Every structure is written in C-alpha cells, then in structure tokens.
Amino acid sequence: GCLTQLYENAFFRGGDVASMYTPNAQYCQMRCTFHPRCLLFSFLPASSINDMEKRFGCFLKDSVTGTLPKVHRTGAVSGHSLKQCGHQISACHRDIYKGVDMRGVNFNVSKVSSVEECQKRCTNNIRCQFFSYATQTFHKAEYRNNCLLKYSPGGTPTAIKVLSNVESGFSLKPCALSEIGCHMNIFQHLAFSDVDVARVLTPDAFVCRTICTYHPNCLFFTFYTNVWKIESQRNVCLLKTSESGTPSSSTPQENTISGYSLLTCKRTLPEPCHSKIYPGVDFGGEELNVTFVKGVNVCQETCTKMIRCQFFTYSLLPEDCKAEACKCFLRLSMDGSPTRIAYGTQGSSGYSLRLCNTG
Amino acid sequence: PISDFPD
Ligand SMILES: *[C@H]1O[C@H](CO)[C@@H](O)[C@H](O)[C@H]1NC(C)=O
Incomplete structure (x- = not known):
C-alpha cells in the first residue's frame, strides 16, 4: 500500500518514464504521485551532482515488479509515489x-x-x-x-x-487560495477551439473535467460524446488552453460538451479519481492481470490494490465466466485512460481508486 | 521579450 519512506544517497536506475526539473525531492515525489505510470522517483539536488544540466533533475520511473536497481550517490534522494496514500495525496506546494x-x-x-x-x-x-x-x-x-x-x-x-x-x-x-472564480458550467452541444495540449478517451465529460483539473496545462476542455457524428472521434476528451487563459471563441456543435478546469475551486474541487462504474462498456488497454472475482465491486477493489492497475473491465460474457466467478481484466495505458471505449458489451468498466484522497 | 534575471 502506502509507502512514504524516502531513501537517502540513492538513485534508482532505469525504468524511466519522464524527467523534469523540480526545486526539491518533495515536489518530484508529487509529480510522481500524479503521473499515471510513476511508482518510483529519484531526485538530484544541486549539491548532489557536478553536471550543470542534471542539477534539480527529477526522474520518474516504473517497474512491473515495483522495484528497481539503485546506486549509492551522495545527496541524491529516492522514494515512492504517494499512490494509495489517501489524504496525503495533494497538489498543493507552498514552499x-x-x-x-x-x-x-x-x-x-x-x-x-x-x-x-x-x-x-x-x-x-x-x-x-x-x-x-x-x-x-x-x-x-x-x-x-x-x-x-x-x-x-x-x-x-x-x-x-x-x-x-x-x-x-x-x-x-x-x-484553494486563488481569488480566481470557480466555474461549474457544463455547456451542452458546445465546442471550444484554441490550443489542444492533450487528448485522451473518457466515458463522459465529468471524467474529462477532472482530468483537465489536475493536468498542468489544461484550463478548459471539449468532450466528444459517444453519439458524435465522426466515429473515430467518439469519447475524445480534448484538454485545452489559450494565450489569455480564457477561451477566445466557442462554437455550437451537436454532441460536444465543454467546461472548465476546477482547480481554482474550494468547496467543490473534484478529487483526482473517478469512482463511477460504467455498465455495458469495455475499456481497452494493456493487460496487467486477469483474476476471477464475484461482482464488479470486488474487481474494482482488485484494481485498486494492484498499484499499477489504472482501470478495469469486469466481463459477464459466458466465455469469461465459470462456477460463481467471472474474470476481472486489470489494465493500464501510457496516460492512465482507456485506449478504446466500446459500447454495447457484456462488461462493466471503471477506474482504480489508487489516487482517491477523500472518503 | 521579458528577459530572465542575469548571471
Ligand atoms: C501582466 O499583464 C496583465 C494583463 O491583464 C496585467 O493585468 C498585469 O500587469 C500582469 N498580470 C497580472 C497578474 O494581472
């Protein structure tokens, strides 16, 4: 479960999924926490390394085994993500x-x-x-x-x-200290334009909004519904920003749903997890593990405990069931979201609750 | 345009 321990004078080696500059190891760990694939991180303070352009280096990592080789290096800091750590998961950095x-x-x-x-x-x-x-x-x-x-x-x-x-x-x-307004608006049949910073698949616009809230470059979004006229663009969640930070235009468009990041919100900030179960839906992705379980809820529990599981599909197809259990497909992608969302299936899909920090 | 702090 929750591993808060840090490792002094240690640098994890290999497994690299992303790197960046951060001012300290605690910020690096936070970016690890919110990166969909990060499990391990290594950080280099200025004091820890001679090479100029490796100072403040924050290296996010993954391992199918949850462990990696590490070398001794004086002053380097290594540790885990705060996935599965509940209320300790926070985007707030005051320093x-x-x-x-x-x-x-x-x-x-x-x-x-x-x-x-x-x-x-x-x-x-x-x-x-x-x-x-x-x-x-x-x-x-x-x-x-x-x-x-x-x-x-x-x-x-x-x-x-x-x-x-x-x-x-x-x-x-x-x-939650901004005096910028919190805008809960969901615009039916309305698209934004501006600049696309990311694209994922989402089952509804509310998941899309939550992803936008916690994505560092997203200020607003447009979601294309499952009945949108162009088949290959169904369930596309478009994360967006603009030069001013506000949308510069809006276009009425059937079966599109738009809204804002909620990161400015106080009482109504969504948590960085999506709890809804979606009947009749398949979530495409890489297979992490197949287990037989009794009911969708235990399947979600199983995904949540499997720290690398991002989302799941619990199938009721006869070929996927036996005496008092059906198979729970544990899955993951590059970005934390399904690679395909398919409707009219005998399966119920959902997400890992590894990042829920409320309840 | 808006330059960084020098040195
Ligand atoms: C820089 O430009 C903005 C434009 O609105 C101006 O209000 C202000 O001088 C600066 N930004 C902030 C924080 O308002």
Whole structure:
C-alpha cells in the first residue's frame, strides 16, 4: 500500500518514464504521485551532482515488479509515489525557494514589494504556474523588485538556476487560495477551439473535467460524446488552453460538451479519481492481470490494490465466466485512460481508486 | 521579450 519512506544517497536506475526539473525531492515525489505510470522517483539536488544540466533533475520511473536497481550517490534522494496514500495525496506546494530562479515562459513582469506579493499575483493570474522575484539586494539594479509570472510545458521549470537574491515559488491555485472564480458550467452541444495540449478517451465529460483539473496545462476542455457524428472521434476528451487563459471563441456543435478546469475551486474541487462504474462498456488497454472475482465491486477493489492497475473491465460474457466467478481484466495505458471505449458489451468498466484522497 | 534575471 502506502509507502512514504524516502531513501537517502540513492538513485534508482532505469525504468524511466519522464524527467523534469523540480526545486526539491518533495515536489518530484508529487509529480510522481500524479503521473499515471510513476511508482518510483529519484531526485538530484544541486549539491548532489557536478553536471550543470542534471542539477534539480527529477526522474520518474516504473517497474512491473515495483522495484528497481539503485546506486549509492551522495545527496541524491529516492522514494515512492504517494499512490494509495489517501489524504496525503495533494497538489498543493507552498514552499518559497530562496536563492533559486525557476525558469519558464515569462508572460508577465511588474514591480512588487515582496516575494509573497509576487506569489499572490501568480496565484490570482490563471496562466501563472510559478514565479520568480528579485529582491532589493539583487546585483543588477534594473531587475530589483521584478515579479515574473511564468508557465511551461507540464508546469515544471525548463531550468532551475542557483542565483543569489532571487526567490521562486509555485502558484497557490492548487492550495484553494486563488481569488480566481470557480466555474461549474457544463455547456451542452458546445465546442471550444484554441490550443489542444492533450487528448485522451473518457466515458463522459465529468471524467474529462477532472482530468483537465489536475493536468498542468489544461484550463478548459471539449468532450466528444459517444453519439458524435465522426466515429473515430467518439469519447475524445480534448484538454485545452489559450494565450489569455480564457477561451477566445466557442462554437455550437451537436454532441460536444465543454467546461472548465476546477482547480481554482474550494468547496467543490473534484478529487483526482473517478469512482463511477460504467455498465455495458469495455475499456481497452494493456493487460496487467486477469483474476476471477464475484461482482464488479470486488474487481474494482482488485484494481485498486494492484498499484499499477489504472482501470478495469469486469466481463459477464459466458466465455469469461465459470462456477460463481467471472474474470476481472486489470489494465493500464501510457496516460492512465482507456485506449478504446466500446459500447454495447457484456462488461462493466471503471477506474482504480489508487489516487482517491477523500472518503 | 521579458528577459530572465542575469548571471
Ligand atoms: C501582466 O499583464 C496583465 C494583463 O491583464 C496585467 O493585468 C498585469 O500587469 C500582469 N498580470 C497580472 C497578474 O494581472
């Protein structure tokens, strides 16, 4: 189940699924937690490695066996995802990092009085994922008190530099501290355009909204329903953003459903798991394991315990059943979502609850 | 456009 233990002076080797820059090991672990395939991570603080462009390196990893070889390396930090850790799963990261410049796409500069006022500007700008603030002591005078609001692919810095008198941090939007509004609207028969940042398959628009909420680049979405006119585009969840952070257009379109990320929401933030069981539906994906169980609910329990299981299909086809048990197909994909969603089947599909952090 | 902090 839940493994919070960290491993000092350790670097996991191989199994790499994604890498990025993060300011510390706790942030790297959080990105591991929310990456659909990450089980293990290794982090390199600036002190731990000579190579410049490997400092602050955060390496997300997977293993069919849940274990990997590791080497001793002084100062490196390794650990697990917080999958299956309930309330410890959080997107909230409050830390101000002093003497650090988290680099990205600068879309906003102003002069501010303190780092916490810079943090506030970032938190209340919908496009800001992280910021950098140069203090009154900063060596170059023109930049003193500059507050830079930034974003980047995946919401992690494209570089992190050790730099005196610069203070960086992330938006507190995922800490429910934004004054940006929470928009629960679901628009029937309505599509957005702008810029597509990801594409997955979802059984309904509500799953699509939840994925958008926790995807670092998604501000709004358009879901194409199972009765959408183009067969190959059925159940397509289009995650989107725009230059301003707001949709620049909207198009009435039958069998399309659109809405917003809910990450600004407080009382009504959806948790990062999808609990609904979907009768009559097959979820395509890589087979992880086939077990015989009594009823869809135990099949979901079985997926949830199998930490690498992302979603499941419990079949009632006669060829998949025997004396008082039917087969539970445990599955996974590259992105956490089904590779195909097929209707009119004798099977009930659902998701792992490994990331539920409520209830 | 908006340059980074120097050095
Ligand atoms: C940068 O540009 C925006 C445009 O709305 C302007 O309001 C402000 O000076 C900066 N961003 C924020 C945080 O409002």
